[PDB]
Amino acid sequence: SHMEKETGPEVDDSKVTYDTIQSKVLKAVIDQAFPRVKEYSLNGHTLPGQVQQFNQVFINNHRITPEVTYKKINETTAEYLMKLRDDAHLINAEMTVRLQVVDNQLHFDVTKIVNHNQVTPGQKIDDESKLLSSISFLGNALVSVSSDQTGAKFDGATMSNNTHVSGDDHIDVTNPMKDLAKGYMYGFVSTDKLAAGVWSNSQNSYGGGSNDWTRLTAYKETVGNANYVGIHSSEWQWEKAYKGIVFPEYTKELPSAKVVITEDANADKNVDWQDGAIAYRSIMNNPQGWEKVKDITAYRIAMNFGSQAQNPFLMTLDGIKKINLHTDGLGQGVLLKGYGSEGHDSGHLNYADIGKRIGGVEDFKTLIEKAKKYGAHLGIHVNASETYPESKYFNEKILRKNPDGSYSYGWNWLDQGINIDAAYDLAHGRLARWEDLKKKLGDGLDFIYVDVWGNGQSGDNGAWATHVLAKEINKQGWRFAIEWGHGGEYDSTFHHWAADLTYGGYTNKGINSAITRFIRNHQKDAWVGDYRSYGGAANYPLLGGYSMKDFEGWQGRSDYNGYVTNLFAHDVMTKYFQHFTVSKWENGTPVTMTDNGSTYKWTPEMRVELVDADNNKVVVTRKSNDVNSPQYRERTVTLNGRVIQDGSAYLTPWNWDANGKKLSTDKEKMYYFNTQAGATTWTLPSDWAKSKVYLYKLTDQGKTEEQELTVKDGKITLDLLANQPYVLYRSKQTNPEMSWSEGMHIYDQGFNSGTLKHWTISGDASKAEIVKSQGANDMLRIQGNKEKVSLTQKLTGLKPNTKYAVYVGVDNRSNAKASITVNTGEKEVTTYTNKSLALNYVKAYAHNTRRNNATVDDTSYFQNMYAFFTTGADVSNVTLTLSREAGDEATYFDEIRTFENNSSMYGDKHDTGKGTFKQDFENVAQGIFPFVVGGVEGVEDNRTHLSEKHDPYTQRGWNGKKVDDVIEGNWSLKTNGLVSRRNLVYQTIPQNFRFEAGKTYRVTFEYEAGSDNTYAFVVGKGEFQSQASNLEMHELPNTWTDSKKAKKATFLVTGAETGDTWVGIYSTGNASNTRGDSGGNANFRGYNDFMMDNLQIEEI
Ligand SMILES: [Ca+2]
Ligand SMILES: [Ca+2]
Ligand SMILES: [Ca+2]
Ligand SMILES: [Ca+2]
Ligand SMILES: [Mn+2]
């Protein structure tokens, strides 16, 4: 009141004809001349709409006075025909606005739009001003509040992803007050009697950051002696075009907005934004798939990359079973990053190209269907921003070009990507790409994760473009997910950088807004989770917040144990709260924090209450407001006044199956988890109190160590291991049959079942054990055997007369022969290894040589050992045998994968056998056989993979490309950019191809090399060391300056008597020659690359 009171034009609506539309509880007085609400009335209390007439709209940004005719449709409903004509700006249109009261809601709908100009979605338009592209009712508040009203206040949320900075504004409406003209995602006005919330489908943006997702605009308007704060819908979009081409019809969404009016809705006897937020759930858009979120407790990524097939579709079902047992049936969400093409960041845009080397559409369909019973939902990683020449959808027309006409290059890794123009893509059939995937896959896939979208790589990725993209995905029945905490606010249900707490640091997490989280906490994982070092909202949020970890290869992640502990430490309780809707949010006093380079104030939530449809009430209370107290980072949680979490421990009722379905009373359970040692005591519900109670320790074998608990006056006391999940039931439970590895033709391919029962052991069974790697990955170990030990299992469900490959991962520390043998009943084939000599450098593979997932002695020499065979007519007697001849030291085996394969490598025949060896790379089972990737990049998503032909884009000449990606057929072996490394790129190993002692072989291949002597053919023996081991080097010349195609290389190689000779490709110390090119041009054109094809090795 110390600044000058403000004054404005008075209201004069003495000549206005008003009508009333009303439900039983809500009356709205409306102008017949224009769709303006003068005032809302509910239970004798009022809120203004737009008090000052503004009978104008903005059409394509032009102020227009519409010619309006009114009709009263019925007691609740009025229509306004609004003719829009301005010849000078080529506006000749009409729209109908319907105002309708439904219970305590007012609906504002543009129900019908007619553009009299000729516009046809999909066709060229000569003049964009002919489009009816935007409709704005800015200037007409849908609801407001006046400074003359007691308790007048506005609350609004904007996007903030910085954990120190709340996105919310709380503004008292006073005269005087600060100017206000600002976009909001959510907005409320209230008095001490009524609160109103406003929703709009407007995909307006005023800019990036807090200016985005601004579907509402709040404005201060001084009317007479009073200030009003009014909430307006932001501008709506309609007919739009790109470079003259009108977008498809589905991009037009009819404008809609809603207001909801409420008294006290949480029984705290105060009326404020929280009541408005509760009521707002009845008018708001709901991101499709949101209902599922609360029961997706175990999210993770399973990764494939670079043709390696690290995680075949049917293998992922075994990880789902492991997590099912270990969590006693918590729901799951597995994002398949690398589901398509050759893996992650291969083949982008071709969404329907399901990865062949991981089992194709047939195994993907099986994974989806069979995962349902475990409440496991599958998602896929796609890209709508960048592609590669290999992709069916790579074309000049789709590529993004800079103003100077150069390509907007993407990242160079396996291949040099080029960004696409997403607006062009939308305007030229993007939708059909999703349709093709949906048709091929059928029903059942849960979610689409669109990587990078939001970062502008493909041009406009803002609110409008994101809603269009999400609608294409939702239309196929899929749920939307994206990378950034700030992305997809309207439609996303999952944000990777909100959920993986380690990413981005404190400025780039989930949505830091009490208002937004209150409204939608239960609908998405988009929030600030607990990560103390970020401070602010991340310093122990009372609602928790998803914490994602992984164990299936994503960024080299393999920590299964840590994954499960994390689920219990953060996610069980986070997900518990998502089964309820927030009803009350109470802040404590501001505290001072110091972290991330500043001292700042933060106002922490001290209590949050939640409720469900059955009026269960959950109360979550922070144990101290003192930021220096250990109790600041602790909560008490009650359900109906019963303590279920207190500090370090919880004993939490879980009444839902893996898919969220309510459990029968007798299947109800409770989870216990305590991050500290110590006895804890819990009050049970009376219907548990008079029952026997049974406790189980949860492990990767499911429920173990059954104990009957002693109940005393309805209490139990639990004194158990810290950081260890348990589950409690009212009756004795059993572990069901998991059918490990169903569809993979063998039982329990990964040694997860805790026994070798399905194997027939010939020899001393005490010498064969399932043991844990340094990464807790179970493996078969055979050691210390004086006689042969063999393990045999039938291969089941094979097709007759069909060609197959089978491999087992093998790491042999013994010199003794370790073998895989298949007997089809007509033929026996066998492959073996003596001591393993090649470390494993595949980052997304579970048994790479990184120390934390090493086999033993801090190393892993795991490599896939293959046999190739063909079934005959009878498939009832096909056996696989793993054996180890006598030796002291250990052989490790894991992951037996049998799958169709059509290679013809052995004297032009499929089956393992003698004859000239040939690799044309046209029928590779997986990886780069007979080579394995070397240590040139250490453990990495290796820059060598099988290159796929897409003429002319992948071949010499396209954008000045010097060398072909593919030499002959559809596939070659490509190494991208690994020049000047002085290290081994890849090598054969004896189990893949053996240079027999004292025999001599001719090794021939065709190759492309972009520069002279950057790569060399090498001959070695034993384990490579970069004392550098001895190598016979053959530097290779470039293949383009004096040749129109790949050159031929040929070498004589004699096998060392020790049997451990191999050959490969080595990155020399020589600098490449990029012929004056730099940047993306030099990367694209292949100066730094090496391609091989048509390998042949024959004895001479
Ligand atoms: Ca003052
Ligand atoms: Ca209230
Ligand atoms: Ca295993
Ligand atoms: Ca080929
Ligand atoms: Mn490629």
Tab-separated table of C-alpha atoms in Angstrom, residues 162-507:
chain	number	residue	atom	x	y	z
A	162	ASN	CA	16.834	-26.236	-11.433
A	163	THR	CA	16.488	-27.868	-8.001
A	164	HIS	CA	17.191	-24.494	-6.297
A	165	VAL	CA	14.484	-22.573	-8.154
A	166	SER	CA	10.776	-23.243	-7.710
A	167	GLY	CA	8.748	-22.696	-10.894
A	168	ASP	CA	5.779	-21.430	-8.857
A	169	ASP	CA	4.493	-17.902	-8.292
A	170	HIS	CA	2.204	-17.049	-5.340
A	171	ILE	CA	0.873	-13.530	-5.794
A	172	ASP	CA	-1.612	-11.638	-3.559
A	173	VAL	CA	-3.984	-9.612	-5.710
A	174	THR	CA	-3.785	-6.092	-4.283
A	175	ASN	CA	-4.026	-2.458	-5.340
A	176	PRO	CA	-1.368	-1.501	-5.930
A	177	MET	CA	0.556	-4.564	-7.148
A	178	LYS	CA	3.378	-5.401	-9.585
A	179	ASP	CA	2.577	-5.633	-13.277
A	180	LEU	CA	1.667	-9.147	-14.467
A	181	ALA	CA	1.512	-10.330	-18.085
A	182	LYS	CA	2.928	-13.852	-18.068
A	183	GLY	CA	2.489	-17.355	-19.487
A	184	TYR	CA	1.747	-20.253	-17.120
A	185	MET	CA	1.328	-24.023	-17.409
A	186	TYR	CA	-1.177	-24.086	-14.486
A	187	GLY	CA	-2.982	-21.147	-12.954
A	188	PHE	CA	-5.403	-20.588	-10.077
A	189	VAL	CA	-7.311	-17.642	-8.671
A	190	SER	CA	-9.044	-17.750	-5.316
A	191	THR	CA	-10.699	-15.749	-2.561
A	192	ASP	CA	-11.353	-17.020	0.973
A	193	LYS	CA	-14.572	-18.598	-0.449
A	194	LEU	CA	-13.820	-20.038	-3.908
A	195	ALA	CA	-10.905	-21.263	-6.004
A	196	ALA	CA	-10.852	-21.618	-9.780
A	197	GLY	CA	-8.389	-23.558	-11.963
A	198	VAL	CA	-8.082	-23.155	-15.713
A	199	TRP	CA	-7.144	-25.725	-18.340
A	200	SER	CA	-6.483	-25.101	-22.029
A	201	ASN	CA	-5.333	-27.343	-24.937
A	202	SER	CA	-3.472	-24.305	-26.370
A	203	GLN	CA	-0.004	-25.385	-27.507
A	204	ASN	CA	1.284	-21.775	-27.294
A	205	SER	CA	4.912	-21.055	-26.454
A	206	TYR	CA	6.414	-17.688	-25.572
A	207	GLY	CA	9.970	-19.090	-25.721
A	208	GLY	CA	12.183	-21.758	-24.155
A	209	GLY	CA	12.489	-22.592	-20.467
A	210	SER	CA	9.880	-21.007	-18.169
A	211	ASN	CA	8.312	-19.351	-21.258
A	212	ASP	CA	7.342	-22.729	-22.733
A	213	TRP	CA	4.239	-24.923	-22.217
A	214	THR	CA	2.522	-21.580	-21.591
A	215	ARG	CA	-1.059	-22.721	-22.316
A	216	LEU	CA	-2.469	-19.971	-20.036
A	217	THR	CA	-1.590	-16.278	-19.774
A	218	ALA	CA	-2.331	-14.348	-16.581
A	219	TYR	CA	-2.827	-10.585	-16.798
A	220	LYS	CA	-3.293	-7.841	-14.265
A	221	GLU	CA	-6.045	-5.464	-15.402
A	222	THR	CA	-6.890	-2.322	-13.467
A	223	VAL	CA	-10.621	-1.723	-13.609
A	224	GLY	CA	-11.878	1.356	-11.719
A	225	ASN	CA	-10.295	1.317	-8.240
A	226	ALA	CA	-9.539	-2.416	-8.355
A	227	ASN	CA	-6.838	-4.720	-9.736
A	228	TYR	CA	-7.999	-7.961	-11.330
A	229	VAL	CA	-5.732	-10.897	-12.063
A	230	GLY	CA	-7.383	-12.861	-14.851
A	231	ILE	CA	-6.425	-16.186	-16.388
A	232	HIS	CA	-6.751	-16.256	-20.164
A	233	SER	CA	-6.176	-19.127	-22.572
A	234	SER	CA	-3.047	-18.516	-24.616
A	235	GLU	CA	-3.351	-18.466	-28.397
A	236	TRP	CA	-4.504	-21.682	-30.108
A	237	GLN	CA	-3.059	-23.144	-33.321
A	238	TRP	CA	-5.047	-24.401	-36.282
A	239	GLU	CA	-4.062	-24.619	-39.999
A	240	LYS	CA	-0.269	-24.563	-40.333
A	241	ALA	CA	2.218	-25.087	-43.155
A	242	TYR	CA	5.943	-25.589	-43.690
A	243	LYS	CA	7.700	-24.169	-46.747
A	244	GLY	CA	4.297	-23.838	-48.348
A	245	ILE	CA	3.054	-27.384	-47.732
A	246	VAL	CA	0.001	-27.561	-45.461
A	247	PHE	CA	0.408	-30.025	-42.623
A	248	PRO	CA	-1.763	-33.126	-42.328
A	249	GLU	CA	-5.330	-32.858	-40.964
A	250	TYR	CA	-4.538	-34.654	-37.671
A	251	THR	CA	-2.325	-31.683	-36.711
A	252	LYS	CA	-5.452	-29.527	-36.317
A	253	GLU	CA	-6.966	-29.844	-32.855
A	254	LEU	CA	-10.137	-27.909	-32.022
A	255	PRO	CA	-9.475	-25.209	-29.375
A	256	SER	CA	-10.811	-26.065	-25.913
A	257	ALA	CA	-10.520	-24.582	-22.424
A	258	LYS	CA	-12.194	-25.293	-19.101
A	259	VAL	CA	-12.635	-23.534	-15.748
A	260	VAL	CA	-13.532	-25.445	-12.562
A	261	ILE	CA	-14.955	-23.634	-9.478
A	262	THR	CA	-14.638	-25.137	-6.011
A	263	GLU	CA	-15.071	-24.565	-2.313
A	264	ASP	CA	-12.793	-26.285	0.251
A	265	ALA	CA	-11.879	-29.626	-1.263
A	266	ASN	CA	-9.360	-31.011	1.312
A	267	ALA	CA	-11.265	-30.258	4.508
A	268	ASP	CA	-8.609	-27.902	5.898
A	269	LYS	CA	-11.223	-25.099	6.089
A	270	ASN	CA	-9.063	-22.740	3.952
A	271	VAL	CA	-9.753	-22.047	0.275
A	272	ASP	CA	-6.614	-21.754	-1.808
A	273	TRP	CA	-4.791	-23.068	-4.903
A	274	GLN	CA	-4.699	-26.612	-3.434
A	275	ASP	CA	-8.482	-26.860	-3.598
A	276	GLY	CA	-8.310	-25.510	-7.124
A	277	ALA	CA	-5.628	-28.110	-7.966
A	278	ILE	CA	-7.741	-30.991	-6.644
A	279	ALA	CA	-10.726	-29.816	-8.679
A	280	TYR	CA	-8.473	-29.236	-11.729
A	281	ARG	CA	-7.941	-33.002	-12.127
A	282	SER	CA	-11.578	-33.219	-13.367
A	283	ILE	CA	-10.946	-30.773	-16.280
A	284	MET	CA	-7.286	-31.421	-17.196
A	285	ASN	CA	-5.745	-33.341	-20.083
A	286	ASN	CA	-4.284	-36.639	-18.902
A	287	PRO	CA	-1.104	-37.911	-20.607
A	288	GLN	CA	-2.057	-41.153	-22.306
A	289	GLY	CA	-0.943	-44.261	-20.428
A	290	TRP	CA	-0.669	-42.381	-17.132
A	291	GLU	CA	-2.682	-45.020	-15.143
A	292	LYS	CA	0.113	-47.537	-15.707
A	293	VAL	CA	2.853	-45.300	-14.225
A	294	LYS	CA	2.103	-46.042	-10.551
A	295	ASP	CA	2.769	-49.755	-11.024
A	296	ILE	CA	5.890	-49.476	-13.189
A	297	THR	CA	8.242	-49.764	-10.238
A	298	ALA	CA	11.291	-51.257	-11.931
A	299	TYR	CA	12.418	-49.197	-14.942
A	300	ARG	CA	15.693	-49.933	-16.750
A	301	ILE	CA	17.310	-50.068	-20.209
A	302	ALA	CA	18.383	-53.187	-22.076
A	303	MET	CA	20.937	-52.201	-24.735
A	304	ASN	CA	22.010	-53.510	-28.116
A	305	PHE	CA	24.706	-51.885	-30.124
A	306	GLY	CA	26.975	-52.264	-33.188
A	307	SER	CA	25.638	-55.581	-34.536
A	308	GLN	CA	26.665	-57.383	-31.319
A	309	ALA	CA	23.186	-58.507	-30.161
A	310	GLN	CA	24.239	-58.168	-26.491
A	311	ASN	CA	20.605	-58.479	-25.387
A	312	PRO	CA	18.393	-60.642	-27.637
A	313	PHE	CA	14.660	-60.095	-27.116
A	314	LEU	CA	14.116	-63.506	-25.470
A	315	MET	CA	17.048	-62.883	-23.070
A	316	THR	CA	15.306	-59.766	-21.769
A	317	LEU	CA	12.431	-62.001	-20.633
A	318	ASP	CA	14.908	-63.834	-18.341
A	319	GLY	CA	15.946	-60.523	-16.745
A	320	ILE	CA	12.200	-59.785	-16.277
A	321	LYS	CA	11.837	-63.152	-14.504
A	322	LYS	CA	14.871	-62.415	-12.257
A	323	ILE	CA	13.383	-59.065	-11.209
A	324	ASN	CA	9.940	-60.669	-10.792
A	325	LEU	CA	11.351	-63.188	-8.295
A	326	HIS	CA	13.554	-60.705	-6.506
A	327	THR	CA	10.781	-58.126	-5.977
A	328	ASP	CA	7.926	-60.625	-5.444
A	329	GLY	CA	5.998	-59.298	-8.398
A	330	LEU	CA	6.644	-55.581	-8.755
A	331	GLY	CA	5.821	-54.143	-12.176
A	332	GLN	CA	8.526	-53.342	-14.707
A	333	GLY	CA	9.355	-51.090	-17.627
A	334	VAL	CA	12.199	-52.094	-19.879
A	335	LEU	CA	13.324	-49.599	-22.485
A	336	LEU	CA	14.886	-51.440	-25.422
A	337	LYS	CA	17.633	-49.125	-26.581
A	338	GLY	CA	18.842	-50.842	-29.728
A	339	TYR	CA	15.597	-52.773	-30.461
A	340	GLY	CA	15.961	-51.876	-34.144
A	341	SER	CA	18.392	-52.272	-37.042
A	342	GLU	CA	21.956	-53.125	-35.853
A	343	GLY	CA	21.274	-51.625	-32.397
A	344	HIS	CA	21.338	-48.255	-30.640
A	345	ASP	CA	22.012	-45.337	-33.003
A	346	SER	CA	21.798	-47.523	-36.102
A	347	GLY	CA	19.050	-47.271	-38.736
A	348	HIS	CA	17.194	-44.325	-37.258
A	349	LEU	CA	13.736	-43.296	-38.554
A	350	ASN	CA	12.969	-46.789	-39.806
A	351	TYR	CA	10.858	-47.582	-36.749
A	352	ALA	CA	9.455	-50.794	-38.258
A	353	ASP	CA	12.954	-52.298	-38.827
A	354	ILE	CA	13.018	-54.576	-35.752
A	355	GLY	CA	16.594	-55.895	-35.155
A	356	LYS	CA	17.139	-59.168	-36.973
A	357	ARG	CA	20.241	-60.190	-34.995
A	358	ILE	CA	18.325	-59.986	-31.684
A	359	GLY	CA	15.443	-62.144	-32.955
A	360	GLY	CA	13.343	-59.904	-35.151
A	361	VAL	CA	9.623	-59.176	-34.952
A	362	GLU	CA	8.789	-62.738	-33.937
A	363	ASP	CA	10.900	-62.720	-30.746
A	364	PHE	CA	9.836	-59.132	-29.973
A	365	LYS	CA	6.162	-60.149	-30.169
A	366	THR	CA	6.910	-63.114	-27.878
A	367	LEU	CA	8.778	-60.932	-25.368
A	368	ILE	CA	5.834	-58.485	-25.241
A	369	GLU	CA	3.161	-61.169	-24.818
A	370	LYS	CA	5.043	-63.300	-22.273
A	371	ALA	CA	6.138	-60.296	-20.208
A	372	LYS	CA	2.488	-59.370	-19.458
A	373	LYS	CA	2.114	-61.957	-16.718
A	374	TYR	CA	5.045	-60.350	-14.897
A	375	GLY	CA	3.514	-56.863	-15.275
A	376	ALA	CA	6.555	-56.000	-17.409
A	377	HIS	CA	5.969	-53.293	-19.996
A	378	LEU	CA	8.279	-52.871	-23.024
A	379	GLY	CA	9.314	-49.571	-24.547
A	380	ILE	CA	11.601	-48.680	-27.451
A	381	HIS	CA	14.182	-45.962	-28.108
A	382	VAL	CA	13.526	-44.097	-31.366
A	383	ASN	CA	14.877	-40.895	-32.918
A	384	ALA	CA	12.867	-38.294	-34.880
A	385	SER	CA	15.791	-35.883	-35.318
A	386	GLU	CA	18.775	-37.596	-36.952
A	387	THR	CA	19.419	-40.399	-39.462
A	388	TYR	CA	22.257	-42.286	-41.271
A	389	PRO	CA	22.817	-43.202	-44.924
A	390	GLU	CA	21.972	-46.877	-44.176
A	391	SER	CA	18.434	-45.965	-43.143
A	392	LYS	CA	15.648	-46.664	-45.683
A	393	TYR	CA	14.463	-43.104	-44.848
A	394	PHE	CA	17.754	-41.309	-45.520
A	395	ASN	CA	17.045	-38.993	-48.482
A	396	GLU	CA	18.310	-35.575	-49.463
A	397	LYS	CA	14.819	-34.033	-49.076
A	398	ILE	CA	14.478	-34.945	-45.370
A	399	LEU	CA	17.954	-33.710	-44.317
A	400	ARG	CA	18.333	-30.489	-42.358
A	401	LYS	CA	20.507	-27.903	-44.085
A	402	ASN	CA	22.153	-24.789	-42.620
A	403	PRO	CA	21.353	-21.275	-44.027
A	404	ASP	CA	24.528	-21.435	-46.168
A	405	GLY	CA	23.283	-24.785	-47.638
A	406	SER	CA	25.666	-27.085	-45.750
A	407	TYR	CA	24.372	-30.202	-43.984
A	408	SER	CA	23.433	-29.920	-40.335
A	409	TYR	CA	25.690	-32.841	-39.419
A	410	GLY	CA	24.859	-35.018	-36.445
A	411	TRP	CA	27.304	-37.128	-34.425
A	412	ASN	CA	29.951	-39.375	-35.967
A	413	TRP	CA	30.315	-42.731	-34.201
A	414	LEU	CA	29.385	-45.951	-36.087
A	415	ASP	CA	28.461	-43.747	-39.065
A	416	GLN	CA	28.216	-39.971	-39.656
A	417	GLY	CA	24.643	-38.934	-38.941
A	418	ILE	CA	22.876	-35.931	-40.439
A	419	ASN	CA	20.055	-34.098	-38.663
A	420	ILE	CA	16.642	-34.099	-40.288
A	421	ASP	CA	14.116	-31.313	-40.650
A	422	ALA	CA	11.292	-32.487	-38.353
A	423	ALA	CA	8.812	-29.975	-39.818
A	424	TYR	CA	9.488	-31.261	-43.342
A	425	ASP	CA	9.250	-34.841	-41.962
A	426	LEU	CA	5.843	-34.159	-40.395
A	427	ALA	CA	4.656	-32.565	-43.650
A	428	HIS	CA	5.834	-35.595	-45.703
A	429	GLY	CA	4.512	-38.787	-44.172
A	430	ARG	CA	6.220	-39.182	-40.776
A	431	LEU	CA	2.990	-40.666	-39.427
A	432	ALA	CA	3.108	-43.684	-41.769
A	433	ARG	CA	6.456	-44.712	-40.179
A	434	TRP	CA	4.756	-45.189	-36.807
A	435	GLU	CA	1.831	-46.932	-38.541
A	436	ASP	CA	4.233	-49.407	-40.184
A	437	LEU	CA	5.745	-50.369	-36.847
A	438	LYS	CA	2.299	-50.703	-35.239
A	439	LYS	CA	1.010	-52.923	-38.089
A	440	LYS	CA	4.074	-55.226	-37.925
A	441	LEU	CA	4.255	-55.419	-34.124
A	442	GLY	CA	0.548	-55.514	-33.262
A	443	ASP	CA	-0.917	-54.596	-29.867
A	444	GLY	CA	0.994	-54.772	-26.639
A	445	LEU	CA	4.003	-52.464	-26.739
A	446	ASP	CA	3.784	-49.966	-23.838
A	447	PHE	CA	5.925	-46.885	-24.559
A	448	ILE	CA	7.909	-44.932	-27.139
A	449	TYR	CA	10.923	-43.058	-25.860
A	450	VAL	CA	11.882	-40.325	-28.350
A	451	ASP	CA	15.561	-39.490	-27.778
A	452	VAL	CA	16.992	-35.944	-28.112
A	453	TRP	CA	13.668	-34.342	-29.158
A	454	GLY	CA	13.460	-31.004	-27.315
A	455	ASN	CA	17.062	-29.977	-28.143
A	456	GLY	CA	16.336	-28.412	-31.555
A	457	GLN	CA	18.620	-30.697	-33.594
A	458	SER	CA	15.731	-31.207	-36.008
A	459	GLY	CA	14.459	-27.600	-35.817
A	460	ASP	CA	11.298	-26.731	-33.929
A	461	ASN	CA	10.718	-29.204	-31.089
A	462	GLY	CA	8.582	-26.897	-28.970
A	463	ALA	CA	5.155	-27.317	-27.413
A	464	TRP	CA	3.050	-27.534	-30.659
A	465	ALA	CA	5.469	-29.819	-32.524
A	466	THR	CA	5.836	-32.020	-29.449
A	467	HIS	CA	2.053	-32.422	-29.035
A	468	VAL	CA	1.757	-33.406	-32.757
A	469	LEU	CA	4.567	-35.986	-32.355
A	470	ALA	CA	3.082	-37.363	-29.128
A	471	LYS	CA	-0.373	-37.643	-30.725
A	472	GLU	CA	1.084	-39.733	-33.623
A	473	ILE	CA	2.588	-42.077	-30.991
A	474	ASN	CA	-0.540	-42.093	-28.723
A	475	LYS	CA	-2.648	-42.841	-31.822
A	476	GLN	CA	-0.888	-46.185	-32.174
A	477	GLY	CA	-1.885	-46.954	-28.583
A	478	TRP	CA	1.544	-46.108	-27.168
A	479	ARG	CA	2.561	-44.051	-24.147
A	480	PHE	CA	4.937	-41.074	-24.688
A	481	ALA	CA	8.377	-40.676	-22.973
A	482	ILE	CA	11.265	-38.255	-23.675
A	483	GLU	CA	14.748	-37.335	-22.543
A	484	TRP	CA	14.672	-33.916	-20.907
A	485	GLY	CA	13.031	-32.828	-17.660
A	486	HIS	CA	11.682	-29.829	-19.605
A	487	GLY	CA	10.346	-31.813	-22.590
A	488	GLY	CA	6.852	-33.039	-23.416
A	489	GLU	CA	5.098	-31.374	-20.445
A	490	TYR	CA	1.650	-31.998	-21.947
A	491	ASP	CA	1.954	-35.671	-23.062
A	492	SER	CA	5.016	-37.302	-21.491
A	493	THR	CA	4.760	-39.844	-18.686
A	494	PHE	CA	8.521	-40.359	-18.203
A	495	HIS	CA	11.526	-38.120	-18.484
A	496	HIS	CA	14.902	-39.897	-18.550
A	497	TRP	CA	16.782	-36.923	-17.012
A	498	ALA	CA	14.233	-36.650	-14.197
A	499	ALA	CA	14.379	-40.409	-13.429
A	500	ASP	CA	18.132	-41.052	-13.647
A	501	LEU	CA	19.142	-38.797	-10.818
A	502	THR	CA	22.863	-38.760	-11.835
A	503	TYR	CA	22.285	-36.945	-15.140
A	504	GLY	CA	22.547	-33.220	-15.794
A	505	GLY	CA	23.366	-31.899	-12.307
A	506	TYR	CA	21.137	-29.637	-10.211
A	507	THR	CA	20.070	-27.319	-13.128
